Amino acid sequence: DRLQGIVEPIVARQPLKLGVTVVHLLDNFYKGIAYGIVDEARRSNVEVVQVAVAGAYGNVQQQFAQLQSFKTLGVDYAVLSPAAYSGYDPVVADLARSGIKTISAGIPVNSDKIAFGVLQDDTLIGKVLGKALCDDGAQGKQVIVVPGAAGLEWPRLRYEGFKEVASACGAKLTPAAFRGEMSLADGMAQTQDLLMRTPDAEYVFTPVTFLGIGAVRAARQANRPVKVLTSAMVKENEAMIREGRLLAVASEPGVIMGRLIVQYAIREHEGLPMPPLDKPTRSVPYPHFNVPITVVDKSNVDTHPYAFYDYPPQGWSI
């Protein structure tokens, strides 16, 4: 079941147009969300008018302009993965005054005028990686923390959940410097620097795919047998898990999040009973569905369904 039993698929009877803007399409996460939206829409009589990208974290003005252009295109919903946590409330409010509701996709945005969201619990992503660390025997051992960028909220939430669980089992974490844009190059440079500064570290924590890849490149160059924790699968991670270089990778099922956005939007649009929504939280100030979290490791890399729920099809682009 492509919707994992969360909701039954239905089909729009009223015309329903979506405009989508996400940060970037360079990994499987936002590209998965975009694929899930597009593929579910063609199953469901929903029109995706445009998929746009900010281009980079911090490209907030680019996204404001994209959301404004959705107004002229007559979309019914804007779907937003923001390039920064803060600053979108005015544009969300402006779209809403025009009858256009905004759906949060994949990551939190700092606006209580969002209609609803479909994402995951970023603190719990950090907690489940913390458990993977603790279960590997990290008590007493040093962990390099490469926490991601500042100003995005969710990297901090992942760090907080990881630190809570890792500290509780006696792991010794480095402090966390929030900087960069979470690129491959950032992961390499930051991990190379922290491996030199933390000669006794046996683990590296990262919150996202490219920082994990960069950390592995740094560990390979330094001949350091550190084990890396990260999030959001790509195909190449599978061999790295089997070879022991990645201890655990949190699954981020972008594809199912995209499908759910379509199924939730049809119901909202036609006044039908909504599928499950959690109450607003401090970081996620709107009703939202959190897809349950699974971790990929040696025990399930050969059976976990991440390839169905987390990978867009090979060769898909929009």
Side-chain angles (χ1 to χ4, degrees), residues 1-307 309-318:
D1 175 10
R2 73 191 185 272
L3 294 162
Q4 283 184 10
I6 291 166
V7 60
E8 132 179 36
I10 60 169
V11 179
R13 296 308 195 286
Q14 303 174 17
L16 199 169
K17 298 162 69 150
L18 305 171
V20 179
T21 176
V22 293
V23 181
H24 69 77
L25 297 171
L26 299 177
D27 61 24
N28 283 338
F29 179 65
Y30 307 111
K31 191 190 303 179
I33 299 174
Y35 170 73
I37 292 174
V38 168
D39 186 68
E40 194 69 15
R42 66 183 281 272
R43 298 172 183 248
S44 306
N45 191 39
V46 169
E47 182 183 350
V48 180
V49 175
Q50 188 177 94
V51 180
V53 299
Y57 291 102
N59 280 6
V60 172
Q61 288 296 326
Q62 289 85 340
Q63 278 193 315
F64 292 169
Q66 288 159 0
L67 291 162
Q68 286 291 322
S69 73
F70 296 169
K71 235 200 286 188
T72 320
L73 295 166
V75 309
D76 300 290
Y77 299 85
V79 178
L80 170 62
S81 300
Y85 183 57
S86 296
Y88 289 77
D89 193 67
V91 67
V92 173
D94 179 46
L95 267 51
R97 291 191 296 269
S98 290
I100 300 177
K101 295 181 180 199
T102 298
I103 300 166
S104 165
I107 42 158
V109 62
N110 196 16
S111 170
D112 62 15
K113 293 174 188 62
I114 294 287
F116 64 90
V118 176
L119 56 156
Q120 284 185 312
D121 186 333
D122 287 291
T123 304
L124 184 53
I125 287 179
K127 292 196 180 188
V128 297
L129 290 173
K131 176 182 165 54
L133 178 85
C134 293
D135 291 347
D136 196 61
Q139 175 174 41
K141 307 184 172 178
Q142 294 182 27
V143 180
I144 287 157
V145 176
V146 175
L152 303 181
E153 191 74 1
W154 54 273
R156 191 192 78 256
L157 298 174
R158 294 180 184 194
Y159 168 62
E160 285 165 3
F162 179 73
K163 180 166 53 174
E164 176 184 299
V165 171
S167 304
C169 72
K172 309 176 157 175
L173 275 52
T174 67
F178 287 78
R179 60 189 286 214
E181 63 178 339
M182 303 193 298
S183 67
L184 292 170
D186 288 332
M188 163 77 98
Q190 292 182 36
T191 305
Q192 182 155 75
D193 179 74
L194 286 156
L195 286 164
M196 184 174 328
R197 292 161 60 198
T198 326
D200 297 334
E202 289 176 78
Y203 297 96
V204 180
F205 169 84
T206 69
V208 302
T209 314
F210 292 162
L211 289 174
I213 303 290
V216 167
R217 295 187 78 200
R220 285 173 180 172
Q221 173 159 108
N223 295 133
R224 285 279 295 278
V226 293
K227 298 173 170 304
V228 178
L229 295 96
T230 193
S231 187
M233 291 284 294
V234 295
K235 176 67 199 309
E236 291 76 11
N237 292 156
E238 298 169 20
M240 299 181 172
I241 292 177
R242 291 193 198 93
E243 288 155 14
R245 173 65 74 183
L246 294 180
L247 173 60
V249 178
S251 167
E252 292 189 63
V255 171
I256 195 170
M257 295 177 203
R259 301 193 183 285
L260 293 168
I261 284 162
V262 171
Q263 290 293 333
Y264 278 56
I266 295 165
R267 287 167 169 84
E268 209 279 336
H269 195 230
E270 301 192 8
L272 308 175
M274 299 293 289
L277 292 159
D278 285 352
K279 297 173 62 174
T281 65
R282 180 180 192 276
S283 293
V284 188
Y286 40 86
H288 59 283
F289 181 75
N290 284 320
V291 179
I293 294 157
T294 59
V295 180
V296 184
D297 58 30
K298 283 196 65 179
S299 74
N300 65 359
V301 63
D302 294 334
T303 58
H304 183 292
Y306 50 75
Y309 297 120
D310 308 16
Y311 294 167
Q314 175 76 223
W316 187 84
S317 61
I318 184 59

